[PDB]
Design an enzyme around this catalytic site. Structure first.
Site, PDB file in Angstrom:
ATOM      1  N   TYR A 142      19.040  80.817  21.346  1.00 56.63           N
ATOM      2  CA  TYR A 142      17.745  80.293  21.754  1.00 56.63           C
ATOM      3  C   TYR A 142      17.776  79.981  23.251  1.00 56.63           C
ATOM      4  O   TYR A 142      17.064  80.636  24.027  1.00 56.63           O
ATOM      5  CB  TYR A 142      17.425  79.043  20.906  1.00 56.63           C
ATOM      6  CG  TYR A 142      16.058  78.457  21.193  1.00 56.63           C
ATOM      7  CD1 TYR A 142      14.931  79.197  20.834  1.00 56.63           C
ATOM      8  CD2 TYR A 142      15.931  77.220  21.782  1.00 56.63           C
ATOM      9  CE1 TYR A 142      13.667  78.705  21.056  1.00 56.63           C
ATOM     10  CE2 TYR A 142      14.668  76.721  22.015  1.00 56.63           C
ATOM     11  CZ  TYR A 142      13.570  77.471  21.646  1.00 56.63           C
ATOM     12  OH  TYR A 142      12.312  76.991  21.841  1.00 56.63           O
ATOM     13  N   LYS A 146      15.642  81.987  26.108  1.00 58.17           N
ATOM     14  CA  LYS A 146      14.669  81.272  26.900  1.00 58.17           C
ATOM     15  C   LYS A 146      15.022  81.162  28.372  1.00 58.17           C
ATOM     16  O   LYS A 146      14.129  81.350  29.205  1.00 58.17           O
ATOM     17  CB  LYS A 146      14.461  79.915  26.280  1.00 58.17           C
ATOM     18  CG  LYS A 146      13.755  80.059  24.945  1.00 58.17           C
ATOM     19  CD  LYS A 146      12.475  80.851  24.989  1.00 58.17           C
ATOM     20  CE  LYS A 146      11.886  80.947  23.584  1.00 58.17           C
ATOM     21  NZ  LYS A 146      10.587  81.632  23.508  1.00 58.17           N
TER      22      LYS A 146
HETATM   23  N1  NAD Z   1       8.690  74.030  17.974  1.00 56.99           N
HETATM   24  C1  NAD Z   1       8.152  75.170  18.514  1.00 56.99           C
HETATM   25  O1  NAD Z   1       7.291  75.941  17.750  1.00 56.99           O
HETATM   26  C2  NAD Z   1       8.468  75.567  19.802  1.00 56.99           C
HETATM   27  C3  NAD Z   1       9.475  74.958  20.518  1.00 56.99           C
HETATM   28  C4  NAD Z   1       9.833  75.435  21.755  1.00 56.99           C
HETATM   29  C5  NAD Z   1       9.179  76.514  22.304  1.00 56.99           C
HETATM   30  N2  NAD Z   1       8.151  77.073  21.600  1.00 56.99           N
HETATM   31  C6  NAD Z   1       7.838  78.397  21.902  1.00 56.99           C
HETATM   32  O2  NAD Z   1       6.387  78.569  21.945  1.00 56.99           O
HETATM   33  C7  NAD Z   1       6.075  79.916  21.491  1.00 56.99           C
HETATM   34  C8  NAD Z   1       5.047  79.906  20.353  1.00 56.99           C
HETATM   35  O3  NAD Z   1       5.423  78.951  19.343  1.00 56.99           O
HETATM   36  P1  NAD Z   1       4.970  79.325  17.824  1.00 56.99           P
HETATM   37  O4  NAD Z   1       5.133  78.120  16.976  1.00 56.99           O
HETATM   38  O5  NAD Z   1       3.566  79.782  17.790  1.00 56.99           O
HETATM   39  O6  NAD Z   1       5.963  80.500  17.293  1.00 56.99           O
HETATM   40  P2  NAD Z   1       5.459  81.330  16.002  1.00 56.99           P
HETATM   41  O7  NAD Z   1       6.643  81.729  15.212  1.00 56.99           O
HETATM   42  O8  NAD Z   1       4.613  80.492  15.127  1.00 56.99           O
HETATM   43  O9  NAD Z   1       4.626  82.632  16.510  1.00 56.99           O
HETATM   44  C9  NAD Z   1       5.391  83.721  17.060  1.00 56.99           C
HETATM   45  C10 NAD Z   1       4.755  85.069  16.671  1.00 56.99           C
HETATM   46  O10 NAD Z   1       5.137  86.079  17.614  1.00 56.99           O
HETATM   47  C11 NAD Z   1       5.659  87.234  16.924  1.00 56.99           C
HETATM   48  N3  NAD Z   1       6.614  87.843  17.755  1.00 56.99           N
HETATM   49  C12 NAD Z   1       7.979  87.745  17.395  1.00 56.99           C
HETATM   50  N4  NAD Z   1       8.549  89.036  17.477  1.00 56.99           N
HETATM   51  C13 NAD Z   1       7.506  89.842  17.837  1.00 56.99           C
HETATM   52  C14 NAD Z   1       7.557  91.175  18.064  1.00 56.99           C
HETATM   53  N5  NAD Z   1       8.746  91.864  17.963  1.00 56.99           N
HETATM   54  N6  NAD Z   1       6.421  91.854  18.420  1.00 56.99           N
HETATM   55  C15 NAD Z   1       5.240  91.114  18.560  1.00 56.99           C
HETATM   56  N7  NAD Z   1       5.224  89.735  18.355  1.00 56.99           N
HETATM   57  C16 NAD Z   1       6.405  89.170  17.989  1.00 56.99           C
HETATM   58  C17 NAD Z   1       6.181  86.712  15.585  1.00 56.99           C
HETATM   59  O11 NAD Z   1       6.021  87.721  14.572  1.00 56.99           O
HETATM   60  C18 NAD Z   1       5.262  85.520  15.303  1.00 56.99           C
HETATM   61  O12 NAD Z   1       4.138  85.937  14.537  1.00 56.99           O
HETATM   62  C19 NAD Z   1       7.375  80.562  20.997  1.00 56.99           C
HETATM   63  O13 NAD Z   1       7.847  81.430  22.036  1.00 56.99           O
HETATM   64  C20 NAD Z   1       8.337  79.391  20.826  1.00 56.99           C
HETATM   65  O14 NAD Z   1       9.696  79.796  21.086  1.00 56.99           O
HETATM   66  C21 NAD Z   1       7.798  76.622  20.361  1.00 56.99           C
END
Ligand code: NAD
Ligand code: NAD
Lengths: 236, 236
Positions: A142, A146
């Site tokens: 992760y 990131k």
């Molecule tokens: N607690 C958290 O949710 C959290 C914490 C830190 C950072 N963020 C970051 O914020 C962002 C959004 O959070 P989230 O909760 O909506 O994540 P999420 O899992 O709910 O949504 C991510 C979506 O993007 C898609 N994505 C992944 N691989 C893909 C691919 N190969 N092609 C196209 N799309 C793809 C996934 O299928 C998923 O549907 C993420 O990058 C996450 O790392 C979130």
């Protein structure tokens, strides 16, 4: 000005809220994910492959024939998800692989579609994590995934990166988002420190319609203490 | 104390100089690369695959049966190479893919073998690039690959990362190395600013035998001005 937004991760927790919200304002929204967003104006389904150039070229080609010579106002790369693990863990290679397809491959494809299809003055958002500004011992894949998004944010603000004149590349950096899957996952967590998705959908709306847009290459932290969310610049 | 070193990239320009040099001191040296180092004490050939867990598990399993319950003094991950490109370039997906198999996959596998096979007090070296401490607009895949190695360096110096007691993880950060392939590649380059490989083989020798070893999680810059090479700490 807005009207054409591309959401990369259109069917995730944050991504579908963004597709719902700009479609509500009657904007043309395309969704890019591994499943159709029948709610988007157009979905592109990403191919499930171990080869990155295959996945990459199929999205670049699908998006190019969907837009032709038409530029979009924003690209929001919200794609991601999470998995833990320190370097000694048996799930390390599994989880690293997930993290890199999810964050590194999507951010990299999104940065090439922005140099090709973003409007002058257009916005590109990348998804970072605040934890990855320092080391992350129990989140090796992760933290690495990131950190590479944060360094890529900087390259794209550099001179002659491909980016259109006036276009900004900002990296959003949350801690934890409020999601139904998170709530049943960390049921004793103090949800009051979790950022509502709606606040980021409002923030993304403002940055697209000129209101208070950060400078290109900025790393924004998104922190919510007691239900109130602040935004804090960070430097690479 | 030294005697057992594992070189990941044993058949590269820097890596074979390291395998030559510690074998010269009669140390047991294993080579890990895509081709045999018949000069090493033992070679492990890395499988050519698009799947990371397959490549990962075959090296972890080959190294585990070669060492059994035997720890090594150092792991030197010198694996890498280079390719340029800004986000608009047609070679972008090709080059990003090379950069990530070469730097991210090797650094990640090397960090898991170190938590399993490094001795207490042992050394692990990672390969960074000084350019990746700032953005890199004309080296998008390189800058990203190398930034992730710098963030991983930090995670491994964090508490409970997997790393043995007393073990250090240092990230070396060159600008340009002196290599015959570089000399015929940049024939008008002022080779006087290129670091000799021999200086790093001496540096690696000292860090392994206790002499002047950096603290864990350190990022060392390797800069050679006019044939003289200095070492400068950098902070993530
Ligand atoms: N607690 C958290 O949710 C959290 C914490 C830190 C950072 N963020 C970051 O914020 C962002 C959004 O959070 P989230 O909760 O909506 O994540 P999420 O899992 O709910 O949504 C991510 C979506 O993007 C898609 N994505 C992944 N691989 C893909 C691919 N190969 N092609 C196209 N799309 C793809 C996934 O299928 C998923 O549907 C993420 O990058 C996450 O790392 C979130
Ligand atoms: N100008 C430079 O050479 C320069 C500049 C900046 C940083 N550095 C870095 O220093 C390090 C060593 O430099 P170098 O000149 O010796 O590079 P090199 O190309 O000469 O040696 C790298 C070796 O590691 C191997 N490695 C790559 N993929 C591997 C894999 N999948 N499995 C096992 N090994 C793999 C390669 O096959 C190659 O033999 C590299 O990480 C490089 O990025 C070098």
């Amino acid at each position: 000005e807005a009207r054409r937004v591309l959401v990369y991760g259109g069917r995730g927790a944050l991504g579908s809220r963004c597709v719902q919200a700009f479609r509500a304002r009657n904007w043309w929204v395309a969704s890019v994910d591994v499943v159709e967003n029948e709610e988007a104006s157009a979905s592109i389904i990403v191919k499930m492959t171990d080869s990155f150039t295959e996945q990459a070229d199929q999205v670049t080609a699908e998006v190019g024939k969907l837009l032709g010579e038409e530029k979009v106002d924003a690209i929001l790369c919200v794609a991601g998800g999470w998995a833990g693990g320190n370097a000694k863990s048996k799930s390390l290679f599994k989880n690293c692989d997930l993290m890199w397809k999810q964050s590194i491959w999507t951010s990299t494809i999104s940065s090439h579609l922005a140099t090709k299809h973003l409007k002058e003055g257009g916005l590109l958002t990348l998804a970072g994590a605040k934890a990855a500004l320092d080391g992350t011992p129990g989140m090796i894949g992760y933290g690495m995934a990131k950190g590479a998004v944060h360094q890529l944010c900087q390259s794209l603000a550099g001179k002659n990166s491909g980016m259109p004149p006036g276009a900004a590349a900002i990296a959003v950096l949350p801690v934890t988002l409020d999601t139904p899957m998170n709530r049943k996952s960390m049921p004793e967590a103090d949800f009051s420190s979790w950022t509502p998705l709606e606040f980021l959908v409002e923030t993304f709306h403002d940055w697209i319609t000129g209101k208070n847009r950060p400078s290109s290459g900025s790393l924004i932290q998104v922190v919510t203490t007691e239900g109130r969310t602040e935004l804090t610049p960070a430097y690479f």
